[PDB]
Design a protein around this ligand. Structure first.
Ligand SMILES: [Zn+2]
Lengths: 217, 97, 108, 126, 96, 107
């Protein structure tokens, strides 16, 4: 029994202080607020959209912030609980960056062609005793077609919560902690990488500190 | 402290309005012999190509002047439930600086 | 060990292939449940019967719904569902009524 | 053990019910986290239908009061020879400047539209 | 409070495109104009994609042309060769 | 791995025994010699050279695998594990990085 480390954080609220990493202004600067053309808008992102400035959809930044606070916090918590985080993408532009991010943290990445049953069949594609991701993050929930990346569905099937940065093409639906925002621009992506990376790092540090404290005690 | 709406109001993309024929400045960030990958702010990037006039000047990092012909390039086709985006802006090169 | 597996149908499904002629495959609908409200089902198919059964059971085990119940014993209220072309009208009843429904429905 | 029925409920709900049943013996470690801090929308599957009748989307096409003025300016004075930045915030285009001038004038310019425009132009010239 | 958007009558909308011939008045007596929308070689009436007209206008033109042909103001199996040195309205390859 | 190690030892022992048997006395003697000896005293004469009798250092014989890509308490070692075919992917990434660096700078 050393289970005061896992529950105390749950009991507290924004205990990693993840909200501090960003503001609305920051998001604006990073061009998170931009979306696709109003014809390309998907039905299930209409509550999150503010309006459309000359047929170009603009996301509600307050809403995004609200969502972000949740999602990032969740991610941090997962990190703290020795949990496997898996970043996924299929934008190519940002594959390298994502890989780097994965490397820097203790976490992983899969920016390449997603084969049929990396999660549903895992038992065969790897050995029989695999630990699947305890969380998943999509920087880009679309594949290189404008169609929802297989992984969301797979994640759902496998009972794994998915965070996801969702633009005006995409279904949130199966995504647990969605974050409305700009997928297709670089600055936004960079910002996202920063923030998520920072959260995970904090979790890693914080947990270690806690452990040390308990040892001392 | 600012809102979001207020921020939107006093931001360059809303200050301009429609993008049709507006001389805009933007930097080039990637290169493959002929084509030039140009970021001009906004949602997407765009590509133009190296002209004959001072081709060895258009390097990675430099500023260039675009005419801008829409921001997104989309269209809906015969059987399409949604318009098919390119993820590019379509903006013609004027020159440098 | 909590779960029990009962079959619902077994069909000898045939298919005409190029060189092989008619291929006698078995297709089996199997259900899984443990009491306590948790249960599911599956359509394992294969050239042998046993194989089909075994696949099907496994499938069922992987695909489970939870079914909330009034007390242990009933549905919460009267259901009227059209699925494709089957209509099913279920009625909530008191204790000591028994299961008076389709044999398959009873088993499930 | 476990469930993989994407469309029935949320993952979380499924997990909880299995726990209740006594099938998933140990909880998955995210479950507690979820309980602590759940999302705003519960993540259930939804079939994306099409708008058919007189059923247009809620979205409002965004317009501000200065937009008209801007349009007028554009009509009069072609899209500025001054290049727009977009990278830096608080950029002031010529159109923006004009708008500002108009605002300064009206309220309390009191000469109404065309006259106001003329005044603005004059100011710019000075 | 103030800085939220206001629903307003669709600004920056350039006034809709014109037929070219919108306010104009087409008569079977006027061969010139009518001749302009006929092929010089076959005397066949140009379509709408070729001519580039509003539907009402096009119909008016065609009926007028027909009237001219019957009433003896215009030729039928060709376009009058006196009216070749005139403004080309229509969009057409042949010759290159 | 343990098994392999054991075999290595056993192989060595076998080699030593062979040396002792043959006129070539030293415990240190080459693979070629060993092969020759084998040929002499297990002469198969079959045309398929893989089907002939051989004894070698089993690190030559056995096709090694990348054993254990995750440690105790899950957590795969290499960061591109969930791709599958991870090593190749890693290599590709490295190459890309190199290319980028080069760009930045300037059978
Ligand atoms: Zn997007």
């Amino acid at each position: 029994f050393n289970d005061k480390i896992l529950n105390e954080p749950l009991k507290h609220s924004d205990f990693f202080n993840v909200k501090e990493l960003f503001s609305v202004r920051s998001l604006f600067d990073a061009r998170v607020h931009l979306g696709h053309k109003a014809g390309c808008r998907h039905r299930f992102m209409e509550p999150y959209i503010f309006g459309s400035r000359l047929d170009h959809d603009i996301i509600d930044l307050e809403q995004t912030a609200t969502h972000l606070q949740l999602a990032l916090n969740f991610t941090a918590h997962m990190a703290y609980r020795k949990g496997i985080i898996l970043f996924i993408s299929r934008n190519r532009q940002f594959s390298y960056l994502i890989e780097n991010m994965a490397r820097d943290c203790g976490e992983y990445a899969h920016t390449r062609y997603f084969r049929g049953g990396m999660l549903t069949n895992a038992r065969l594609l790897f050995g029989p005793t695999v630990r699947l991701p305890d969380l998943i993050i999509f920087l880009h929930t679309l594949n290189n077609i404008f169609e929802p990346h297989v992984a969301v569905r797979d994640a759902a099937k496998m009972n794994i919560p998915t965070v996801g940065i969702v633009d005006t093409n995409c279904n949130p639906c199966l995504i647990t902690y969605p974050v409305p925002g700009n997928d297709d621009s670089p600055l936004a992506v960079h910002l996202y990488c920063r923030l998520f990376q920072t959260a995970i790092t904090r979790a890693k540090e914080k947990r270690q500190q806690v452990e040390a404290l308990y040892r001392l005690q | 402290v600012e809102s979001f709406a207020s921020m939107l109001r006093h931001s360059p993309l809303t200050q301009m309005g429609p993008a049709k024929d507006k001389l805009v400045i933007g930097r080039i960030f990637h290169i493959v012999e002929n084509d030039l990958y140009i970021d001009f702010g906004g949602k997407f990037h765009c590509v133009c190509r190296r002209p004959e006039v001072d081709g060895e000047k258009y390097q990675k990092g430099t500023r260039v002047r675009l005419r801008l012909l829409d921001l997104e390039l989309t269209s809906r086709f015969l059987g399409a439930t949604t318009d098919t985006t390119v993820l590019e802006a379509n903006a013609v090169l004027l020159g440098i600086q | 060990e909590d779960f029990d597996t009962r079959i619902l149908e077994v069909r000898n499904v045939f298919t005409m292939t190029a060189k092989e002629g008619r291929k006698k495959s078995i297709r089996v609908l199997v259900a899984v449940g443990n009491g306590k409200g948790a249960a599911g089902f599956s359509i394992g198919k294969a050239t042998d019967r046993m194989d089909a059964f075994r696949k099907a059971k496994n499938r069922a085990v992987h695909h489970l719904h939870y079914i909330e119940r009034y007390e242990d014993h009933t549905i919460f209220h009267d259901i009227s569902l059209r699925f494709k072309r089957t209509h099913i009208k279920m009625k909530k009843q008191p204790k000591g009524y028994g299961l008076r429904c389709h044999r398959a429905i009873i088993t499930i | 053990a476990g469930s993989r029925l994407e469309t029935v409920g949320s993952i979380f709900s499924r997990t909880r019910d299995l726990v209740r049943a006594g099938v998933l013996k140990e909880k998955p470690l995210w479950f507690d986290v979820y309980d602590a801090f759940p999302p705003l929308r519960e993540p259930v599957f939804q079939r994306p239908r099409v708008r058919y009748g007189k059923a247009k989307a809620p979205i409002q096409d965004i317009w501000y009061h200065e937009d008209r003025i801007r349009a007028k300016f554009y009509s009069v004075y072609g899209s500025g020879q001054r290049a727009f930045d977009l990278f830096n915030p608080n950029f002031k285009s010529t159109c923006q400047r004009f708008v500002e001038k108009y605002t300064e004038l009206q309220k309390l310019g009191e000469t109404d539209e065309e006259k106001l425009f003329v005044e603005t132009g004059k100011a710019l010239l000075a | 409070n103030e800085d939220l958007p206001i629903s307003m009558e669709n600004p920056y909308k350039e006034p809709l495109k014109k037929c070219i011939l919108c306010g104009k008045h087409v008569d079977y007596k006027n061969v010139q104009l009518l001749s302009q929308f006929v092929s010089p070689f076959t005397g066949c009436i140009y379509g709408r994609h070729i001519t580039g007209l509003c539907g009402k206008k096009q119909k008016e033109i065609t009926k007028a042309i027909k009237r001219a042909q019957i009433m003896g103001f215009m030729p039928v199996t060709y376009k009058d060769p006196a009216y070749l040195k005139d403004p080309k309205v229509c969009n057409i390859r042949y010759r290159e | 791995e343990d098994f392999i190690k054991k075999q290595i030892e056993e192989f060595n022992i076998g080699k030593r025994h062979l040396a002792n048997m043959m006129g070539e006395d030293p415990e240190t003697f080459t693979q070629e010699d060993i092969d020759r000896a084998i040929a002499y005293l297990f002469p198969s004469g079959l045309f398929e050279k893989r089907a002939r009798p051989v004894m070698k250092h089993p690190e030559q014989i056995f096709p090694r695998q990348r054993a254990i890509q995750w440690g105790e308490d899950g957590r795969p070692f290499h960061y591109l594990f969930y791709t599958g075919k991870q090593s190749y992917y890693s290599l590709m990434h490295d190459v890309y990085g190199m290319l980028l660096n080069l760009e930045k700078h300037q059978r």
